[PDB]
């Protein structure tokens, strides 16, 4: 995640193993139950896309759901690209590039790039955009997996 250091700057720090394991354990115990979404939200505080793929990729089991989510993440990403067209002409030397759906999904962007966008002024909340897609896709799952 990207956290604020004592000095008063935003720097990246790694997520903790008993945080990781707590994510694992939630999924083990409460599967598709709604409490998973606030839980997720708390444990995703200050998290990167990269950390969010890590969390999704480290799941075991419920592979039908994991595939449905993936496909929702790509749909929501396809929709990001649709709604926000690429911008006019070449990229400025003085500036950094606008993200695509795949940069938001973490796929085409690097960590330093993910830190550029979030730490820069104005900052862009690529975590929160992926977060809604995850929560939206979580609703899809919850609604389906209701019996």
């Amino acid at each position: 995640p990207i956290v604020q250091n004592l000095q008063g700057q935003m720097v990246h720090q790694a997520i903790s193993p008993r945080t990781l394991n707590a994510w694992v354990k939630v999924v083990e115990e409460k599967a598709f139950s709604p409490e998973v979404i606030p839980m997720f939200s708390a444990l995703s505080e200050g998290a990167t896309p990269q950390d969010l793929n890590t969390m999704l990729n480290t799941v075991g089991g419920h592979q039908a759901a994991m595939q449905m989510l993936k496909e929702t993440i790509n749909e929501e990403a396809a929709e990001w690209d649709r709604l926000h067209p690429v911008h006019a002409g070449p990229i400025a030397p003085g500036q950094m590039r606008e993200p695509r759906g795949s940069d938001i999904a973490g796929t085409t962007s690097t960590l330093q790039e993910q830190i550029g966008w979030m730490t820069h002024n104005p900052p862009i909340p690529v975590g929160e955009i992926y977060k809604r897609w995850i929560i939206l896709g979580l609703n899809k799952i919850v609604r389906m997996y209701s019996p």
């Binding site: 449905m68 496909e71 389906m144």
Partner: protein, 74 residues
């Protein structure tokens, strides 16, 4: 176990089968285009006659929540 050996039982819920499919698909390392081909093809083909019948009625263009809710009573 090979991906071709993944098939749906005569009493097995589709759901339990689809889970098995994307687990084995999860151990295949092929290009995405090939894995798309496997998805639309092999899944339905090794699905049981009762659900297979059901899935034929969904037509093409169908997505996983609609397939998964379509074969639920079977």
């Amino acid at each position: 176990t090979s991906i071709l050996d993944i098939r749906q039982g005569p009493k097995e819920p589709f759901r339990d089968y689809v889970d098995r499919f994307y687990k084995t698909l999860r151990a295949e390392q092929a290009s995405q285009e090939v894995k798309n081909w496997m998805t639309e093809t092999l899944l339905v083909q090794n699905a049981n006659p009762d659900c297979k019948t059901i899935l034929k009625a969904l037509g093409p263009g169908a997505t996983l929540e609609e397939m998964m809710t379509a074969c639920q009573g079977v």
